Amino acid sequence: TFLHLPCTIEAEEAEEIGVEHLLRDVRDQAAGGLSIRLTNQLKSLKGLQSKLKDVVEYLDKVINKELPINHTILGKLQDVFNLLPNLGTPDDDEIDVENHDR
Amino acid sequence: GCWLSSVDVNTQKSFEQLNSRAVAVVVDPIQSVKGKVVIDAFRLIDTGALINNLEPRQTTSNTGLLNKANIQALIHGLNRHYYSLNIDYHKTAKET
Amino acid sequence: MVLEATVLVIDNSEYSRNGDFPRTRFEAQIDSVEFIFQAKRNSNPENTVGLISGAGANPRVLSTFTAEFGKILAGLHDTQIEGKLHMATALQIAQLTLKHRQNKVQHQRIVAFVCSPISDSRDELIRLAKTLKKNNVAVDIINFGEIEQNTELLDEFIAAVNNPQEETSHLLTVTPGPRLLYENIASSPIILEEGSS
Amino acid sequence: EIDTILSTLRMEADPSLHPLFEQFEKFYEEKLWFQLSESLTKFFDDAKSTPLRLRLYDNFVSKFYDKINQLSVVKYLLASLKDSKDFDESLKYLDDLKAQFQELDSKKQRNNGSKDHGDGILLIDSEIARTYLLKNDLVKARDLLDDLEKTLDKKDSIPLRITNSFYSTNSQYFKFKNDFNSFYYTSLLYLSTLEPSTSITLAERQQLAYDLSISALLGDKIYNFGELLHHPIMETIVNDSNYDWLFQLLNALTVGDFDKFDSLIKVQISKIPILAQHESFLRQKICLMTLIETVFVKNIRMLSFEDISKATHLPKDNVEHLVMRAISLGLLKGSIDQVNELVTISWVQPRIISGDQITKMKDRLVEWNDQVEKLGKKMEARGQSIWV
């Protein structure tokens, strides 16, 4: 079976100059001012939203349709719950001191 | 910089014979820093074109502008052995 | 005879490690290729013989069309042997192999060596017949391993295909025991049969 | 020639085995050794009490062994020399068989021009290693097995048969040593590499099922009790007296349940002396698993010691000791506070699969799915200088 390798894409400095100037847009590989960085926060959150939905759905279709179990998916997603922050802890109180400072 | 030597005129000449209109694109990639500078196209000028003034018929029915990347280097071969005309870039939206 | 492309389906199986032809069948099927390949050239030197395998987990291309006998054997040396025939599947890849050619004037024929009985079905083979005669591909079955201890229903498909074609379809029986596999296919019609309009 | 070989073994044999012999004459004569390879393989199922089979195999070892797959020479021989309980005899015959395969292979790789014959040498080393384990020369096998391991990792085109013999042999090594944890995982690797092809018997399924269950109970880090339950192997045999309790012990641990678990443990002290000196271990083990289940199943991750105390039927002093043992073992990471009386856990090792655990994960994502969706509208709308 096939093991996902993540990707980020790269080019030598030979190729790259021709990429940067041929492009005639804003670019998701570069950025300008504050205004573009407000855009980025909306786009980044939208990706989470869509991706969460796929996880729930996958959990549904396992107990409905009854596709075979994967402890690779279920096991990784077990970790997510212990990593999860919660509220009312001394840690969140330390965030608020930093928010006043900044 | 983009210019042509004698040896490259001999190479140029036979592509001209094979395909009536043909171009030579010359890339100097170590005076290139915007991926676009010091890249020009060139094309043979005939010996008939100089003496009977049929050289600048390529300044007409086009934009009629030539944008230099090397002022010194282009101008030398612009009368001697080539005429340079400016280069453009393109893509479809799938590509972009 | 003249201008003919022929996709050899050569099976490599668990019935071919038997030694009814010297020193097993793998060794006798190597010798079949040489005679076939030369003979074609003798009629017309612009003949090409291709090769695919009905063997293993997935039938695959072992070699493409070529004017060299050397390249075709070069590809055959590394074949599977664990598999069995898949007859329906063999025909659909061979049809694809005969599409890609230098010229298209060449005749379309498939000759398939049977060493092992079908792992597919009768339901599939009925369909294959209607498919083939639209494109004038002949089915020509050299059987020698589905008559050793078996029976074949492939007689039906030969006749269903045969019409005026580029190459006619006929059934070529070769004893399963010793009779020297290589000379029997060479002696029997494989270019002595030709088409008509 | 072969006529004497087959005729003698008939008298020694049971009458119901008489046709088989005659079928070995028949497929010799046809010169079709495809059906012969199947007939020999079949022979040892019907005649595993009598080593008529071993004497039969001798003739066919020296004849077809390149005119039949070598994979099949290793399958019928293995049943014969495993169940041989004279193991000097086993070693001697196997070593002579290896010398014939080493000569053969050099000409025959180019001669057939379709076949391989280097595959066979690896498997003989595995059989040689098994004979040493039974004989109780566990060290001799393990260092043979390590050199064999090296060769296998550098190949990627090797059959599914090769891996099956190697793991089986490695499991028997940990069972002699009684490493419970090590046995569990390497027997799981045998199960995966199982072939529809005859290289198993009906006996072997029931006996792996017994040995797995026993190892599991007594592991120091296992929690693959639910993984076993769901597995075919242990599913089919629960209706026999030996495997009845054995199922119910495995089941009571999965589910954390004490009322069924402790009731079973009384019986097994008397019954089985293996489990009459692990009595202390097994009671700590059920409590240990339950501890991880109660905090985790909740969406609050931090939990008072009191709730644990009625649950694991232990006072507070042992609660802290249970928790400490887990951290050591690398099953949890976290803290103990006897000031605030809290256990605050923060890393968990994978839970058992069960439909209802799935349900609790799926419901848990719901809670925070709402927040992403509602916030995604607020931020979009807001900002009038998003690109102005």
The b-or-e profile of D86-125 (16+ CB within 10 A means b, else e) is ebeebeebbeebeeebeeebeebeeebbbbebebbebbbb
C-alpha span between D221 and D289 (Å, rounded):
10
- Shortest CA distance from A31: residue in chain D: D387
Residues of B in contact with A20 (CB under 8 A): 34-35
Residue spans of alpha helices (H) in D298-354:
305-311, 316-329
**Which residue pairs, CB below 8 angstroms and at least 24 apart, start in D183-190?**
D183/D211, D183/D212, D183/D215, D184/D212, D184/D215, D184/D216, D184/D219, D184/D222, D184/D224, D187/D211, D187/D212, D187/D215, D189/D163, D190/D164
Cβ–Cβ gap A75/D348 under 8 Å: no
C-alpha span between D165 and A66 (Å, rounded):
33
C-alpha span between D354 and D226 (Å, rounded):
8
C-alpha span between D290 and D307 (Å, rounded):
12
Tokens 């393990």 map to which residue? Answer: D142
C-alpha span between A23 and A96 (Å, rounded):
42
Q: Are strands D332-337 and D342-348 parallel, antiparallel or unpaired?
A: antiparallel
Q: How many CA atoms lie less than 13 Å away from D175 in the CB half-sphere?
A: 23
Phi-psi region of D341 (alpha: psi -120 to 50; beta: other; left: phi over 0): left
Cβ–Cβ gap D361/A36 under 8 Å: no
C-alpha span between C87 and C112 (Å, rounded):
9
- In sequence order, the 6+-apart residues with CB closer than 8 A to the CB of C18 are C24, C25, D31, D32, D33, D34, D67
Is A19 strand, coil or helix? Answer: helix
Tokens 């995966």 map to which residue? Answer: D192
Is D280 strand, coil or helix? Answer: helix
- Find out whether D91 and D98 touch, Cβ atoms under 8 Å: no
Residues of B in contact with A25 (CB under 8 A): 96
Residues of D in contact with A79 (CB under 8 A): 348
**Amino acid code (one letter) for D82:** K
DSSP letter assigned to residue D47: -
- In sequence order, the 6+-apart residues with CB closer than 8 A to the CB of C83 are C12, C13, C54, C55, C56, C57
- Find out whether D279 and D265 touch, Cβ atoms under 8 Å: yes
C-alpha span between D128 and A86 (Å, rounded):
58
C-alpha span between B17 and B21 (Å, rounded):
9
- Shortest CA distance from B29: residue in chain A: A14
- Find out whether D128 and D80 touch, Cβ atoms under 8 Å: no
Residue spans of alpha helices (H) in chain C:
25-43, 69-76, 87-99, 122-133, 155-161, 181-187
Pick from D67, D113, D115: CB nearest C19? D67
Kindly state the tokens that stand for D322: 């249970």
Resolution in A: 4.5
Q: Is D302 on the interface with C (CB under 8 A)?
A: no
Smallest CA–CA separation between C117 and chain D, in Å? Answer: 13
C-alpha span between C13 and C116 (Å, rounded):
7
Q: Is D372 on the interface with A (CB under 8 A)?
A: yes
Smallest CA–CA separation between A12 and chain D, in Å? Answer: 31
Q: Is D111 on the interface with C (CB under 8 A)?
A: yes
Q: Which of B86, B89, B69 is nearest to A21 (CA)?
A: B89
Pick from D355, D372, D385: CB nearest A49? D372
Residues of C in contact with D66 (CB under 8 A): 17
Pick from A48, A62, A81: CB nearest D372? A48
Backbone dihedral angles phi then psi of residue C6, each to the nearest 5 degrees: -140, 125
Q: How far apart are the first and last CA of chain C?
A: 15
- Taking only Cα atoms into account, the Rg of chain B, rounded to an integer number of angstroms, comes to 14
C-alpha span between A79 and D350 (Å, rounded):
8
Pick from D30, D35, D68: CB nearest C17? D68
Tell me how crowded residue A60 is: count the other CB atoms within 10 A of its CB. 13
CA distances from B33 to A26, B37, C93, D154 (A): 20, 7, 51, 47
Cβ–Cβ gap A82/D358 under 8 Å: no
Pick from B35, B91, B96: CB nearest A21? B35
C-alpha span between D177 and D188 (Å, rounded):
18
Cβ–Cβ gap A18/B36 under 8 Å: yes
CA distances from B88 to A18, A23, B67, D108, D373 (A): 13, 13, 11, 65, 45
C-alpha span between C83 and C94 (Å, rounded):
18
Which positions in chain B have a beta carbon within 8 angstroms of at least one beta carbon in chain A?
29, 32-36, 89, 91, 96
- Find out whether D123 and D165 touch, Cβ atoms under 8 Å: yes
Kindly compute the dihedral angle of the four CA atoms of residues D122, D126, D127, D129, in this order, to the nearest 10 degrees: 140
Q: Which of C7, B21, A64, C153 is nearest to D355 (CA)?
A: A64
